[PDB]
Paper text:
To shed light on the structural basis for importin α3 selectivity, we crystallized the predominant isoform of human RCC1 (or RCC1α47) in complex with importin α3 lacking the IBB-domain. Large crystals containing eight copies of the α3:RCC1 complex in the asymmetric unit were obtained in the triclinic space group. Clear electron density was observed for the RCC1 N-terminal tail, which is missing in our phasing model, and contains a bipartite NLS between residues 4 and 26. The tail occupies the entire NLS-binding groove of importin α3, spanning ~50 Å between Arms 2 and 9. It continues into a seven-bladed β-propeller (residues 30–421) that packs against the lateral surface of importin α3, making minimal contacts with Arms 1–4. The second region of contacts includes RCC1 residues (20-SKKVK-24) that occupy the major NLS-binding pocket at positions P1–P45, with K21 at the crucial P2 site. The critical S11, which is phosphorylated during mitosis to reduce association of RCC1 with importin α342, 43, occupies position P4′. Accordingly, the refined B-factor of RCC1 atoms is lower at the minor NLS box than at the major site (85 vs. 105 Å2), suggesting the minor NLS-binding site is the main site of interaction with importin α3. The open conformation of Arms 1–3 accommodates the β-propeller domain of RCC1, while making high-affinity contacts with the NLS. Importin α3 selectivity for RCC1 is therefore a direct consequence of a flexible solenoid that undergoes local conformation changes at the N terminus to avoid steric clashes with the RCC1 β-propeller.
Residue numbers in the entry:
A (entry chain K): 4 to 421
B (entry chain A): 71 to 487
The structure:
């Protein structure tokens, strides 16, 4: 007598079936070329080993065309047409995700140790996150805070190479602050991870504050959604879009409302008070039936936004000309129109600066010029939205703009004529 | 932001309006989330996508369209059925010959979805001749991402054992898999091994094909690979292979598979322990020679160890291993099992709530006692020592007909004084 062979119960079905190809209006598609400017101390300009500084845009050698460019804190990440990711900058915390053992290889752009078709990229102070076509999110580098290192996914452990944030739900958008990361999924769920010391996560209320152990870090470094009472409605609150300030976060829902949370020490969240917002407070300062908000951005203590009509507003701390309203206007806690700006296509913010991009292709800069991020060639603090000019801008339009700590990166395209 | 505008904008003759309407369509993953399914399926937007998918010299249009059909077919089976009723598949196959790589890759993606839906859809797509064109893409100059999507489509082709995939299709796929199994990438290897997994789970026939492909000697060493996922997939595949006949299992064994298992039996992941003990539970159910091959590998002590201190699932699979060795093994082999202190942990399982495990343990003990004749005294006292006899005496209740009847038959037969 012999027993018959036993079959296996079905498994987790890892390759299960029909994975979705994500699409979102934030994905950059039109190819272009990369420009950099500002302090290139640790090679965040990607121009060479001997290049330490550029006060006006210069072209960066990339073997392929570039569809998106984002500038981290002390590094810079470019997304090519073919889908590969290029990184160059400071690899001390692993934000590049490639071997920089050979000194001088971090000074020039290099192909990231990753084999994927990447559709979106986001970079902050010490980290770098990529979003692939199928919706799964990769992440490498490390997080920090006002305090020492807090790790990336396993607490107190940085990552030198790309690591998947394993999630069952595909992600359509990634967005990065300095030391936090938000991921907007297809279903509208909004996951967050990273530091929450100042409340830039929103899903960890006043129950704790900087627990310096493995308990709080163990709860923070796990991606979780933000649950909200929809005031009558079942389920949860959905979301249409999301944006990351430096230490704070905004989100736009299908209801058109605008939510946000983080540190409001200099009123950079539109709140009347300086109280820290650990709950996604609904901002009454932005509630308007006529105005429909489309674009958000923010620095460490300032914030710039833009509406569907093209008018770009600003609010937050006013020192060093980071608002650019009236050549020394006092601190403002409400969104303020900048009359000097034409129809703006997209807005962006640096560490202590701010940039605007009009529909015709012109780019304006304003803020602290200590690092020559303004492109004017003058370290003098600029209070007016001065237009940036350079030979690499002649007969070219500005596709996108990003700015970090000591530099600024542009994406530009030749004009359609000739 | 409008619900139906596109149907007019996509009917224009201006390539900008059409190109833009289908792009703003391409924004459907977010666009779909707001309205439910029915209305957009009824109004008729889908045919519009196919018509424009035909027209060449406008690659952007084809790309946007195939994007949309792709994301539509990803939904419920009813949506994919709505896609295949448009007779869009032959147009995807026509796009497999396009010079633009983005169009080919998108087509391969969407065909991946359609095939992955179900076995009937799979046999439909094969009936049109997708396998040879898809496999023709494998070259040393292929981009890595596109290759990953191709392998993914292979996995979808090998799935759905209910109607097993066509014989000829597997005969066409296997050599490509034998080429992909040597590849350096981790994910490509993973997907390949899972394709093998489904091919082996199909049945004895397809297992015999896999064995005839000469891929087994290349598959077995993956059990000790560095990455955990390759290990898991390879273990499932090989295990499905040994779910077959005797000689097939013996082909797994002749490639020196047991040598890898000491690690797998001590691996930190619980799932690998469970699957490996499952494997051995299929090995002990083979002929006497294979059982002796398990004993000769010093694996019984770890099997019992997991039977004592493993999780519930692994304990279950180990119980099956012991019982299979009990009914299949020789008398001296079961003797070796006894002198390895198997009775106490094997009997401590009689207190679980699962009736199947209890039937396994009681059947195994009954077979042991029926087998050994002169030492039936000794073994009986062994069960009396570990308190297992108490457990058997308290198992005679109304939880299950088989547990009580078998239980008391064991008691009266072997435990009367």
């Amino acid at each position: 007598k012999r027993i018959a062979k036993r079959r296996s119960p079905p498994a987790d079905a890892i390759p299960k079936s029909k994975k979705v190809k994500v699409s979102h209006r934030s994905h950059s598609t039109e190819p272009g070329l990369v420009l950099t400017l500002g302090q290139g101390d640790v090679g965040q300009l990607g121009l060479g080993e001997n290049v330490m500084e550029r006060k006006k845009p210069a072209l960066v050698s990339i073997p392929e065309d570039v569809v998106q460019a984002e500038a981290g804190g002390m590094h810079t990440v470019c997304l090519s047409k073919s889908g590969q990711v290029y990184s160059f900058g400071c690899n001390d915390e692993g934000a590049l995700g490639r071997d920089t053992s050979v000194e001088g290889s971090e000074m020039v752009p290099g192909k990231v140790e990753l084999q994927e078709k990447v559709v979106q990229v986001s970079a902050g102070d010490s980290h770098t996150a990529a979003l692939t076509d199928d919706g799964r999110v990769f992440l490498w580098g490390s997080f920090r805070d006002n305090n020492g290192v807090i790790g990336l996914l396993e607490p107190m452990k940085k990552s030198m190479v790309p690591v998947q944030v394993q999630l069952d739900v595909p992600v359509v958008k990634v967005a990065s602050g300095n030391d936090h990361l938000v991921m907007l999924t297809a279903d509208g769920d909004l996951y967050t991870l990273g530091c929450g010391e100042q409340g830039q996560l929103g899903r960890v209320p006043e129950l704790f504050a900087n627990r310096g152990g493995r308990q709080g870090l163990e709860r923070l470094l796990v991606p979780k959604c933000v649950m909200l009472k929809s005031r009558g409605s079942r389920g949860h609150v959905r979301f249409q879009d999301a944006f990351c300030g430096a230490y704070f976060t905004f989100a736009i829902s299908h209801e058109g409302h605008v939510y946000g949370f983080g540190l409001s020490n200099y009123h950079q969240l539109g709140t009347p008070g300086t109280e820290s917002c650990f709950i996604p407070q609904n901002l009454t300062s932005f509630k308007n039936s006529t105005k429909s908000w489309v674009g958000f951005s923010g620095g460490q203590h300032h914030t710039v936004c833009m509406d569907s009509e093209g008018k770009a507003y600003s609010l937050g701390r006013a020192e060093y000309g980071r608002l650019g309203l009236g050549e020394g206007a006092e601190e403002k806690s409400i969104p303020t129109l900048i009359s000097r700006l034409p129809a703006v296509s997209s807005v962006a913010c640096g560490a202590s600066v701010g940039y605007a991009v009009t529909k015709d292709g012109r780019v304006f800069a304003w803020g602290m010029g200590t690092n020559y991020q303004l492109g004017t060639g003058q370290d003098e603090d600029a209070w007016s939205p001065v237009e940036m000019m350079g030979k690499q801008l002649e007969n070219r339009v500005v596709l996108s703009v990003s700015s970090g700590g000591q530099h600024t990166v542009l994406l530009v395209k030749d004009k359609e004529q000739s | 932001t409008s619900l139906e505008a596109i149907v007019q904008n996509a009917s224009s003759d201006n390539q900008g309006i059409q190109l833009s309407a289908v792009q703003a369509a391409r924004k459907l993953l977010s666009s779909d989330r707001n309205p439910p399914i029915d209305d957009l399926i009824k109004s008729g937007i889908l045919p519009i996508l196919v018509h424009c998918l035909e027209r060449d010299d406008n690659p952007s249009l084809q790309f946007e369209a195939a994007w949309a059909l792709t994301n539509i077919a990803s939904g419920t089976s009813e949506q994919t059925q709505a896609v295949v009723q448009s007779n869009a598949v032959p147009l995807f196959l026509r796009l497999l010959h396009s010079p633009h790589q983005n169009v080919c890759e998108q087509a391969v993606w969407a065909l991946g979805n359609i095939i992955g839906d179900g076995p009937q859809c799979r046999d439909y797509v094969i009936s049109l001749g997708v396998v040879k064109p898809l496999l023709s893409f494998i070259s040393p100059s292929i981009p890595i991402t596109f290759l990953r999507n191709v392998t993914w489509v292979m996995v979808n082709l090998c799935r759905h054992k209910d109607p097993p995939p066509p014989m000829e299709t597997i005969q066409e796929i296997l050599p490509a898999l034998c080429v992909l199994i040597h590849h350096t990438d981790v994910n490509i290897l993973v997907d390949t091994v899972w394709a093998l997994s489904y091919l082996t789970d199909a049945g004895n026939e397809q297992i015999q094909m896999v064995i005839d492909s000469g891929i087994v000697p290349h598959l077995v060493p993956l059990l000790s690979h560095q990455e955990v996922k390759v290990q898991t997939a390879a273990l499932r595949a090989v295990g499905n292979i040994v779910t077959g006949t005797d000689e097939q299992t013996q082909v797994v064994l002749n490639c020196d598979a047991l040598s890898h298992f000491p690690a797998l039996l001590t691996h930190p992941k619980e799932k690998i322990n469970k699957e490996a003990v499952w494997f051995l539970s299929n090995i002990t159910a083979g002929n006497q020679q294979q059982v002796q091959a398990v004993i000769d590998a010093n694996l019984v002590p770890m099997i019992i160890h997991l039977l004592d201190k493993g999780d519930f699932g692994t304990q279950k699979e180990a119980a099956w291993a012991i019982s299979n060795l009990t009914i299949s093994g020789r008398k001296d082999q079961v003797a070796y099992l006894i002198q390895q202190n198997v009775i106490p942990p094997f009997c401590n399982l009689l207190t679980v709530k699962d009736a199947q495990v209890v039937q396994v343990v009681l059947d195994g003990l009954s077979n042991i006692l029926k087998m050994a004749e002169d030492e039936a005294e000794t073994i009986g006292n062994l069960i009396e020592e570990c308190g297992g006899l108490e457990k058997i005496e308290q198992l005679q209740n109304h939880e299950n007909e088989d547990i009580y009847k078998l239980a008391y038959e064991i008691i009266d037969q072997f435990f009367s004084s």
